[PDB]
Amino acid sequence: HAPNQALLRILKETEFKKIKVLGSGAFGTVYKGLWIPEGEKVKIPVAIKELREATSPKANKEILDEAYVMASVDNPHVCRLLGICLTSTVQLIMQLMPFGCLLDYVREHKDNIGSQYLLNWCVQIAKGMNYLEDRRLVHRDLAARNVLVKTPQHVKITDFGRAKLLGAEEKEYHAEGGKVPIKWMALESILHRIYTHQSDVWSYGVTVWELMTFGSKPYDGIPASEISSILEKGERLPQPPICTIDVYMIMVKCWMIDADSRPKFRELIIEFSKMARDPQRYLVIQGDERMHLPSDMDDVVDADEYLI
Numbered sequence: 001h002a003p004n005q006a007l008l009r010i011l012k013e014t015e016f017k018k019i020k021v022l023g024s025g026a027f028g029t030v031y032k033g034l035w036i037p038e039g040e041k042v043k044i045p046v047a048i049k050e051l052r053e054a055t056s057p058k059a060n061k062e063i064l065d066e067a068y069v070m071a072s073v074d075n076p077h078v079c080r081l082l083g084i085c086l087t088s089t090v091q092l093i094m095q096l097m098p099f100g101c102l103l104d105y106v107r108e109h110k111d112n113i114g115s116q117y118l119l120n121w122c123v124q125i126a127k128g129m130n131y132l133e134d135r136r137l138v139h140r141d142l143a144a145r146n147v148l149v150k151t152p153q154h155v156k157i158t159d160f161g162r163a164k165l166l167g168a169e170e171k172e173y174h175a176e177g178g179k180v181p182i183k184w185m186a187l188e189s190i191l192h193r194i195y196t197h198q199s200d201v202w203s204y205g206v207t208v209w210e211l212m213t214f215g216s217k218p219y220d221g222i223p224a225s226e227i228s229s230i231l232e233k234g235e236r237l238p239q240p241p242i243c244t245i246d247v248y249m250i251m252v253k254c255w256m257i258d259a260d261s262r263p264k265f266r267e268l269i270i271e272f273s274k275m276a277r278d279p280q281r282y283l284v285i286q287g288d289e290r291m292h293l294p295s296d297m298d299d300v301v302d303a304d305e306y307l308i
């Protein structure tokens with residue numbers, strides 16, 4: 001393993017300005033804001049998480065471990081952590097992704113989402129995951145809820161709360177126990193708590209299924225405890241109505257019990273790119289041709305153009 005020379009930037013609180021609330025969770029509130037590094041004549045749209053005063057030492061540690069992972073990744077299809085701020089509670093500053101999570105996006109915009117967007121998103125997520133594989137990172141929580149939308153044309157993988165860096169000689173991560181996203185997990189993760197890049201491929205297949213059904217819940221109504229035996233009997237998620245057999249076969253291959261029989265991310269990039277070149281041959285969507293989606297503010301620059 002090579003040295004990790006990623007830079008962690010510690011921002012001062014007077015450099016960023018909270019504009020409005022975007023969300024509230026167990027761990028603190030998220031604000032829309034601007035990051036205005038002193039004397040640089042640039043304003044960067046950001047989301048700012050300010051942790052709650054009541055957050056435990058254990059929670060703080062876990063959040064900082066997630067920041068470490070996010071600071072260590074740099075790819076157009078993976079979320080961008082700008083830095084953290086050590087005020088009385090920790091604040092985290094990330095690139096603003098104004099269209100929210102992809103799961104919610106596809107549910108809310110399903111009558112205007114055409115085949116080109118769906119296939120491009122699959123390509124993009126596969127590129128991000130391929131990059132994480134190159135970095136020897138196993139995500140362990142890939143799902144449409146954990147993909148952010150910068151613009152309808154550009155998505156990025158997020159939520160590194162479960163991510164693990166494999167050791168140099170290590171091929172599998174062995175987990176301890178807790179509350180796990182069963183319906184996205186590879187069979188070997190459910191049974192034996194084993195995670196690899198190939199178990200992430202399984203989750204990728206489920207993520208694709210979520211997109212192609214415009215945000216349906218996988219195995220809806222089936223309790224999580226029944227999933228493993230359903231899988232062991234050879235049953236899988238059904239073929240979405242818009243999917244040609246070409247697309248469904250790819251998902252099916254992601255859900256092979258033999259981990260080595262599943263596609264690799266680099267191959268998923270290739271197969272979805274082929275399809276993205278002639279999208280209406282691969283996804284059959286009523287009204288496809290018709291569909292369109294969105295495409296002081298002086299000195300504003302996106303985080304992706306503010307390089308270190």
Ligand SMILES: *[C@H](CC(=O)NCCn1ccc2ncnc(Nc3ccc(Oc4cccc(C(F)(F)F)c4)c(Cl)c3)c21)CN(C)C
Binds near residue numbers: 049067094099
């Ligand atoms: C869908 C995502 C969504 O819309 N969430 C609301 C907040 N929001 C709106 C736009 C936007 N852009 C960018 N980021 C966020 N939120 C956000 C999440 C996490 C975060 O920083 C961290 C980093 C590491 C760990 C944590 C945590 F403490 F563990 F939570 C937080 C920041 Cl700064 C911002 C945005 C959600 N859908 C319900 C699934």
